Amino acid sequence: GFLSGKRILVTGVASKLSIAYGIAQAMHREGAELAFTYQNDKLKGRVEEFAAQLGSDIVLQCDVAEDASIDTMFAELGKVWPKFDGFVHSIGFAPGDQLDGDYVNAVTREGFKIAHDISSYSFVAMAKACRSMLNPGSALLTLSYLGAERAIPNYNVMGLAKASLEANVRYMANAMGPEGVRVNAISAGPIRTLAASGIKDFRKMLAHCEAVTPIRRTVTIEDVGNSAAFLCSDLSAGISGEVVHVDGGFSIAAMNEL
Amino acid sequence: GFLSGKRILVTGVASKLSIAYGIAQAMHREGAELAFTYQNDKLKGRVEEFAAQLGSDIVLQCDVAEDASIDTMFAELGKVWPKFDGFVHSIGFAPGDQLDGDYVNAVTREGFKIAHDISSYSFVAMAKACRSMLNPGSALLTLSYLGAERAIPNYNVMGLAKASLEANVRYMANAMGPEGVRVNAISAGPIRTLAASGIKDFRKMLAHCEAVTPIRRTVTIEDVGNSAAFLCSDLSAGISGEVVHVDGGFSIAAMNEL
Amino acid sequence: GFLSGKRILVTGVASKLSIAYGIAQAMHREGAELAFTYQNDKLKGRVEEFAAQLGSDIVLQCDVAEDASIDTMFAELGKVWPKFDGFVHSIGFAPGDQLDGDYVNAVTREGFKIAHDISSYSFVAMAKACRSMLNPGSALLTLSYLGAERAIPNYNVMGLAKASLEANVRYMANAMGPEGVRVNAISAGPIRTLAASGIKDFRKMLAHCEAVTPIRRTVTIEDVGNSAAFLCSDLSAGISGEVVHVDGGFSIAAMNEL
Amino acid sequence: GFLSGKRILVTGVASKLSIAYGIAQAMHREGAELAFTYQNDKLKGRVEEFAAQLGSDIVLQCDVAEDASIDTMFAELGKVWPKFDGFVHSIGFAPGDQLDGDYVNAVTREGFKIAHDISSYSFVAMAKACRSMLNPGSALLTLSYLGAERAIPNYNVMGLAKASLEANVRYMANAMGPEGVRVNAISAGPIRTLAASGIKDFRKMLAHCEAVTPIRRTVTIEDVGNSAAFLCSDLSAGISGEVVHVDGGFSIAAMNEL
Ligand SMILES: NC(=O)c1ccc[n+]([C@@H]2O[C@H](COP(=O)([O-])OP(=O)(O)OC[C@H]3O[C@@H](n4cnc5c(N)ncnc54)[C@H](O)[C@@H]3O)[C@@H](O)[C@H]2O)c1
Ligand SMILES: NC(=O)c1ccc[n+]([C@@H]2O[C@H](COP(=O)([O-])OP(=O)(O)OC[C@H]3O[C@@H](n4cnc5c(N)ncnc54)[C@H](O)[C@@H]3O)[C@@H](O)[C@H]2O)c1
Ligand SMILES: NC(=O)c1ccc[n+]([C@@H]2O[C@H](COP(=O)([O-])OP(=O)(O)OC[C@H]3O[C@@H](n4cnc5c(N)ncnc54)[C@H](O)[C@@H]3O)[C@@H](O)[C@H]2O)c1
Ligand SMILES: NC(=O)c1ccc[n+]([C@@H]2O[C@H](COP(=O)([O-])OP(=O)(O)OC[C@H]3O[C@@H](n4cnc5c(N)ncnc54)[C@H](O)[C@@H]3O)[C@@H](O)[C@H]2O)c1
Ligand SMILES: CN(Cc1cn(C)c2ccccc12)C(=O)/C=C/c1cnc2c(c1)CCC(=O)N2
Ligand SMILES: CN(Cc1cn(C)c2ccccc12)C(=O)/C=C/c1cnc2c(c1)CCC(=O)N2
Ligand SMILES: CN(Cc1cn(C)c2ccccc12)C(=O)/C=C/c1cnc2c(c1)CCC(=O)N2
Ligand SMILES: CN(Cc1cn(C)c2ccccc12)C(=O)/C=C/c1cnc2c(c1)CCC(=O)N2
């Protein structure tokens, strides 16, 4: 496939509904050799089983909250991939409290802190830690959301961390381009996954999206997986520091509901 | 390839240096069945020879300045492709005079008029004319430039027409999404082709670009061809009304020259 | 007032509901000497009255579709103002057929051409014609709408003309900056004016803009007029080539309706 | 002045070169009653003097890193102003090590955390703390820099904090709009101030911004102060959640250097 010969680290898989899951399957379908991380004890099992199904037996622990855990992970991966071709960063978090109701009243200094640490800093931390291990031709990929560009009810502080993340995308691309690494993000339309069902009227929001989105449907993890597979391959050699909208054109339209 | 089973119309090929040429070769490499247009008597020969080399014998005349010529072209193509899957719009023009020196002094009402007619209107005119002929799953693709977003010395009125073109990209995507067509643009970094060497210090400009572009090199028609092949395939099903920057991250950085 | 000692030409005045009317009002209050233009005779008297009420008796015919009319107006203007400090471009048009229903079906080469010639080129057409008459410190201002950046139903080809107009703002600014002229635009939110009559369910639309705007009200020709006086006064000396949004924050939110 | 009858809290004043100083000046001239805060004692006296010169004797300590200090300041402020009309956030910080050289190598979890906590969260931290004290019609204003939107050498992690800050502007605006509060930011061009000392060849940089800016000069704390008085006065009533560029058009051009 267009990814044969590449070695890519996929973080973030948590269920077959996960975006990273759709991204893994698509990169494997195109021939990439895959590696995986899991956050904690609760997820190791799920991730080993999916990794097995996609031909991989590289399943390593990584909590991006901790610098030591990122370094350790890259040390283990190094025994198997002295070098590789990039990773998909598909991680995000904000303390429950942060994403519901009036933004000014919900946010707290801690909430803000954690949300940015886990969703934005964690992307350049992973890069820092594996930098020398990357081949020229490598590609870094993170996942963002429209909340970073416009204020969306309930997304609250996550919008601030996503904005920080896209800017990180730009500064990471400008810093690493000289050594041969590209860095981009996919701004995905809303998809019902684990990380969502626990907040607001996500179901009513999806109905609204399907209605006003130009392609008249919400996007799927297969859609994201395909663009992701592409952003992480040599077919996108001319793209870097870009935030690509894979939301069916939702964001480029206005007042369609009327 | 990821384009097998697709039928795509490629306009704009003029020499092996042409962007549309790099786009044609890449879509053929991925398995698309190709069709071609040529502007006038001067180019027919070149285009038939390239079309032959990429397995196509559909070479039709089309001057987007004329509504009758667009309709005729789509009538001929229809005898061979009752239906197809989209086209690449890779056409642009502004009267010589328009692209050199102070913008306010260069522009004229005619210049402005022609520049917008040929570079922006021509994209929705082609869509209008072949609309019913498009399969669901189809994709429209045009080519734009950073001049549309920022003022660039000498690009002058072309910047205004490109801006009009990207907005057309958005309105065409919002109008056609319901019937199953996506519409996007690639904003390409500068490449030395026919359409350029006749204006300003393009050679010195390219040197400047290679220096400050994150990937530290200017992009090639192969780079554009690959992203183009992608935007026009089912792998980008979640992308529509988007202007993708294939300029190596040039535009997302600032003051690198220092 | 912050506009004391400034001489400002104001186009577009057609009724007391006109944005150009709100603007004229604010600049007069801020102490500017005013001058007005009118498209045709039907408006001659109507506009002379508006002008008297604002300390002004300079009232000239000017149809922007003709270089000769623009030239002739500025020559008359030159009798009473050999030098002046800028002008307000408050002109937009597109044949009626153009603004209703599916954009792809409604648009025509002619409708596109007229929309771009009157809504966008006239702005630089005017700057061209009075360039040697502007004093250092002058400012030019035009009006745009969100349809330039987003695809909005029915706005159709005006969206393209507005995107062209916003780009004309940046190219004008870049070329005239060095001789001391700033150029900007105000992207106003929806306002009930003549030109806004008959396009769709404007009324319902206004009701939507009102429930979803951060400030929870639509903006007024007074809100716009104040930003406009600011933008053409030395107070904004550090602002050029910018599109300022005076829409109560409508464009920066998303999904407030849900 | 257009700011008569308004009560404005101004943070960030540290020397007469400070942007907050230029702003304070303009709002005083426009007739606003002022109040100032100071980070620590080293600045206590220095700031009280600045304040006397502006018709003000309200001068309070406030270190934004602490919720308790912010709360305590606003309680003191409350003794002389049970209600007020908004405040100016003119605070940015990032450990020195953070701002020099390759961004990926320079950045650290701690540097990132501090940069985001002081440069971005403090802005909403303040709004949270004085929310019930704001009158209808109030305005909040913060300062950002182009590094939020583009990757600029050495600005490094400040770029991420500024992108977070610009997004905080839109979420603040969206949540406080309904109770009559507008929130905006000014993205200022390069100015020689304390904080700007020691980062790179700032001097050479200033020389670049000057040759390439449309207005061909760098902006001043007076240029910024005037836009700031405008943005916090009812004159800008129709503007909320906007990032206004007061950089003489620098960001809207490209390749003027060539
Ligand atoms: N689902 C959507 O609609 C949507 C839309 C746009 C963007 N995104 C973004 O895409 C990414 C993937 O989201 P998803 O929908 O697949 O959610 P998900 O819950 O399925 O998975 C995201 C992962 O975050 C990981 N994570 C949290 N803290 C971690 C830590 N400290 N260390 C390591 N891993 C940690 C979890 O293990 C989890 O698998 C996120 O960055 C999210 O913000 C999601
Ligand atoms: N070359 C670059 O650096 C660059 C960068 C960004 C965007 N672009 C854009 O990409 C597209 C392709 O440009 P290129 O560099 O391949 O130039 P090119 O000269 O190689 O080809 C462009 C085509 O324009 C066609 N054309 C002009 N008028 C026409 C008409 N009336 N009817 C039909 N066809 C007509 C010509 O036949 C020509 O083949 C253009 O839209 C251009 O503005 C080029
Ligand atoms: N009203 C809104 O909702 C809104 C919002 C954003 C931007 N705008 C823009 O503001 C400007 C003013 O519009 P308005 O809403 O005040 O409507 P309006 O109809 O009151 O004023 C526009 C003016 O267009 C002028 N005009 C048309 N053709 C002309 C020509 N050929 N030569 C000279 N003048 C000509 C008319 O004389 C008229 O006074 C337009 O460019 C419009 O696109 C309007
Ligand atoms: N000067 C420029 O070139 C420029 C350009 C665009 C934006 N800005 C922004 O404008 C703002 C003002 O910067 P400046 O250039 O006037 O520099 P400055 O150093 O003169 O002022 C910034 C203020 O930061 C305050 N500060 C730092 N930590 C603080 C804390 N923990 N608690 C309370 N106050 C604290 C200091 O008291 C100081 O007065 C910053 O946010 C900066 O990022 C500056
Ligand atoms: C795009 N989405 C989904 C989404 C959430 N909200 C509020 C929306 C609103 C509109 C459209 C999409 C969304 C996301 O990025 C998920 C964010 C997220 C972060 N931390 C979380 C949770 C969700 C949940 C669990 C947790 O503890 N921490
Ligand atoms: C990006 N480019 C190349 C380019 C041109 N200038 C001025 C630049 C400046 C900087 C970077 C790229 C460019 C283009 O889109 C080509 C535009 C173009 C249009 N009409 C033309 C000519 C060139 C040429 C022949 C004609 O008659 N009509
Ligand atoms: C923002 N608006 C108002 C508006 C129009 N449509 C379609 C909207 C949709 C949504 C929100 C606002 C608007 C405008 O800029 C006016 C545009 C305009 C141009 N030429 C016209 C007419 C209107 C009308 C008369 C004519 O002949 N030529
Ligand atoms: C625009 N600027 C000035 C500036 C800085 N760099 C690196 C630039 C590069 C190009 C153009 C302008 C600038 C700023 O916003 C100031 C940022 C800043 C934050 N924390 C700091 C310091 C500076 C310094 C002192 C500290 O401890 N913490």
Decide: D161 and A171 in contact? Cβ < 8 Å: no
Residues B35 and B47: beta-carbon distance below 8 Å? no
CB C88 within 8 A of CB C141: yes
In whole angstroms, give the CA distance from residue B9 to residue B18: 15
Which structure tokens are listed for A151? 């204020």
CA C211 to CA C188: how far, in whole Å?
A: 17
**Which residue of chain C is at minimal alpha-carbon distance from A147?**
C254
- Test site for ligand 3: of C17, C40, C88, C90, most ligand atoms within 8 A of the Cβ: C90
| CA separation for the pair C178, C182 (Å, rounded) | 9
Task: Name the residue with tokens 């402020």.
Answer: D77
Q: Can you tell me the distance from the alpha carbon of C168 to that of B155, in angstroms, rounded to the nearest whole number? A: 12
Determine the Cα–Cα distance for residues B188 and B248; give it in Å rounded to an integer: 9
The phi-psi region of residue A180 (left if phi > 0; otherwise alpha if psi is between -120 and 50; otherwise beta) is left
Q: Helix, strand, or coil here: A229? A: helix
**Range list of H helices, chain B:** 19-29, 41-53, 67-80, 103-106, 109-116, 122-130, 156-176, 194-197, 202-212, 221-231
Query: Cβ of B258 and D146 within 8 Å?
Result: no
CB B237 within 8 A of CB A223: yes
Position of tokens 């003051």? B255
Sheet holding B59-61, edge to edge: B59-61, B33-38, B7-10, B87-89, B138-144, B181-188, B243-246
CA distance D138 to C170: 32
Residue D182 bridge partners (DSSP): D139
DSSP state of A18: S
Query: Alpha-carbon distance D237 to C226, whole Å?
Result: 9
Tally of CA atoms within 13 A in the half-sphere of A56 that contains its CB: 27
Helix (H) or strand (E) holding A227: helix A221-231
Give the list of residues 6+ apart from residue C53 with CB closer than 8 angstroms, or none: none
For residue D111, give both structure tokens: 């540097």
Contact at 8 Å (CB) between D104 and D157?
no
Closest to C7 in 3D by CA, of C184, C135, C143, C126: C135
Alpha carbon distance A70, A125 (integer Å): 8
What separation in angstroms does the CA of C146 have from each of A252, B88, D213? Answer: 11, 28, 26
Q: Measured between alpha carbons, how far is A70 from A37 in angstroms, rounded to an integer?
A: 10
- Spatial separation of the C-alpha atoms in residues B11 and B59, rounded to whole Å: 10
The answer to whether the CB of B169 falls within 8 A of the CB of B184 is yes
Token code pair at residue D24 = 């304070």
Neighbours of chain B (3+ CB pairs under 8 A): A, C, D
Q: How far apart are the first and last CA of chain C?
A: 44
How many angstroms separate the CA atoms of A251 and D119, rounded? 28
Quote helix, strand, coil % in chain D, to nearest 5: 50, 15, 35
d(CA A138, CA A150): 31
β partners of residue A188: A246
C77 Cβ contact list (under 8 Å, min separation 6): C9, C35, C58, C60, C84, C130, C133
In angstroms, rounded to a whole number, what is the distance separating the alpha carbons of residues C182 and C172?
A: 8
Closest chain C C-alpha to D252 CA, distance in angstroms: 6
D154, D101 in Cβ contact below 8 A? Answer: yes
In degrees, rounded to 5, the angle at the alpha carbon of residue C247 between the alpha carbons of residues C244 and C249 is 95
**Quick one: how far is CA B53 from the chain centroid?**
21
Q: Which of A149, A257, C190, C73 is nearest to D164 (CA)?
A: A149
Q: What type of residue is C241?
A: G
Give break positions in chain C: residue before each, C–N beyond 2.5 Å.
none
Q: DSSP per residue over D103-136, as a string? A: HHHH--HHHHHHHHIIIIIHHHHHHHHHGGGBPT
Token pair listed for D251? 């960001």
Contact status, residue A25 vs residue A1, Cβ threshold 8 Å: no
- The two structure tokens encoding residue C147: 């349809």
Residue type, D103: Y
User: What are the C-alpha distances in Å from C105 to residues A249, B128, C97, C101?
Assistant: 20, 7, 10, 8
Cα–Cα distance between B216 and B250 in angstroms, integer?
A: 9
Residue type, C215: I
* Tokens representing residue A205 in the block: 């929001």
Residues 6+ apart with CB under 8 A from B70: B62, B64, B125, B126, B129
Cβ–Cβ contacts within 10 Å for residue B100, how many?
15
* Nearest-ligand number for the alpha carbon of D98: 8
Name the β-bridge partners of B186. Answer: B143, B244
Q: Which residue of C has its CA nearest to D137?
A: C215
What number of other Cβ atoms are within 10 A of residue C79's Cβ? 8
Q: 3-state SS string over A45-100?
A: HHHHHHHHHCCCCCEEECCCCCHHHHHHHHHHHHHHCCCECCEEECCCCCCHHHHC
CB of C217 within 8 Å of any CB in chain A? no
Grouping H, G, I as helix, E, B as strand and the rest as coil, residue A8 is strand
CB-CB contact of C179 with D141 (8 Å):
no
B101 in the Ramachandran plot: left (φ > 0), alpha (ψ -120 to 50) or beta? left
Query: How many other C-beta atoms are found inside a 10 Å radius of the C-beta of residue A110?
Result: 11
Question: Is B68 touching D (CB cutoff 8 A)?
Answer: no
Q: How far is CA B139 from the centre of its chain?
A: 13
Active site residues of C: 145, 155
Cβ contacts of C170 on chain D, cutoff 8 Å? 249, 252-253
Structure letter (DSSP) for residue B15: S
**Token output for A47:** 């991730």
Compute the distance between CA of residue B122 and CA of residue A35 in angstroms, rounded to an integer: 47
Report residue D84 as tokens: 């007020």
End-to-end CA distance of chain B: 44
Cβ atoms < 10 Å from Cβ of D110:
13
Q: Is C94 on the interface with B (CB under 8 A)?
A: no
Distances (CA, A) of C151 to A245, B40, B166, B168, C155: 15, 34, 11, 9, 8
Question: Edge-to-edge strands of the sheet including D33-38?
Answer: D59-61, D33-38, D7-10, D87-89, D139-144, D182-188, D243-246
Resolution at which this structure was determined, Å? 2.3
Identify the H or E element spanning B141: strand B138-144
- Method of determination used here: X-ray
φ, ψ of residue D8 to 5 degrees: the values are -125, 120
Other beta carbons within 10 angstroms of residue D102's beta carbon come to: 16
DSSP state of A148: G
Cα–Cα nearest to B177, from A252, A149, C107: A252
Closest CA to D140 of D214, D63, D85, D99: D85
The residue assigned the tokens 């050498």 is D153
A98 a known binding residue? no
Using an 8 Å Cβ cutoff, are B189 and B218 in contact? Answer: yes
Three-class secondary structure of residue D95 per DSSP = coil
Q: Which amino acid is at B245?
A: H
Question: Whole-angstrom Cα distance, residue B159 to residue C124?
Answer: 14
Q: What contacts B208, CB < 8 A, 6 or more positions away?
A: B257, D255, D257, D258
Give the per-residue SS3 of D14-77.
Answer: CCCCCHHHHHHHHHHHCCCEEEEEECCHHHHHHHHHHHHCCCCCCEEECCCCCHHHHHHHHHHH
Would the annotation count D194 as a binding residue? Answer: yes
CB burial class (10 A; 0-12, 13-18, 19+) of residue B101? middle
In sequence order, what are the residues at sequence separation of 6 or more whose Cβ sits closer than 8 angstroms to the Cβ of residue B229? A235, B1, B2, B3, B23, B26, B27, B29, B30, B32
- Asked if A19 and A221 touch (Cβ cutoff 8 Å), the reply is yes
Architecture of D1-258 per CATH? 3-Layer(aba) Sandwich (3.40)
- Ligand 1 centroid–CA A118 distance in Å is 10
Q: Which amino acid is at A116?
A: H
Q: Which of D103, D121, D155, D171 is catalytic?
A: D155
The separation between the first and the last C-alpha atoms of chain D, rounded to the nearest angstrom, is: 44
User: Residues enclosing ligand 2, CB less than 6 A?
Assistant: B 12, 14-15, 18-20, 39, 43, 62-65, 90-93, 118, 143-145, 188, 190-191, 193-196
Partners of D244 in the beta sheet?
D186
Plot region of B12 (φ>0 → left; ψ -120 to 50 → alpha; else → beta): left
Interface partners of chain C (CB pairs < 8 Å, 3 or more) are A, B, D
Tokens standing for residue B217 = 């090199």
Question: Among positive and negative, which fits the CA dihedral D151, D157, D163, D165?
Answer: negative
Dihedral angle computed from the Cα positions of residues D108, D110, D113 and D118, in that order, rounded to the nearest 10 degrees = -110
Which pair of structure tokens corresponds to residue A185? 């993000």
B222, B228, B230, B236 alpha-carbon torsion, rounded to 10°: 160
- What DSSP string describes A23-47? HHHHHHHTTPEEEEEE-SHHHHHHH
Give SS3 for B240: coil
Distance CA D98, CA D103 (A): 8
Q: Cβ neighbours of residue A197 under 8 Å, at least 6 residues apart?
A: none
What are the CA-CA distances from residue A184 to residues B145, B146, B244, B255, D146 (Å)?
19, 18, 12, 20, 19
Quick check: helix, strand or coil at residue D223? helix
The amino acid at residue B46 is R
Query: In degrees, to the nearest 5, what angle opens at C-alpha C171 toward C-alphas C165 and C174?
Result: 140
* DSSP H or E run through A22: helix A19-29
Q: Name chain B contacts of D258, Cβ cutoff 8 Å.
A: 153, 201, 204-205, 208
Structure tokens at A21: 């899951």
The string of DSSP letters for chain C reads -TTTT-EEEE----STTSHHHHHHHHHHHTTPEEEEEESSGGGHHHHHHHHHTTT---EEE--TT-HHHHHHHHHHHHHH-SSB--EEE------GGGGSS-HHHH--HHHHHHHHIIIIIHHHHHHHHHGGGBPTT-EEEEEE-GGGTSB-TTTTHHHHHHHHHHHHHHHHHHHHGGGT-EEEEEEEPP---GGGTTSSSHHHHHHHHHHHSTTSS---HHHHHHHHHHHTSGGGTT--S-EEEESTTGGGB-----
Tokens coding C247: 């829409």
Query: What's the start-to-end Cα distance of chain A, in Å?
Result: 44
Q: DSSP state, B134?
A: B
Hey, where are the domains in chain C?
Answer: 1-258
CA distances B165 to A240, B38, B115, Å, are: 23, 21, 11
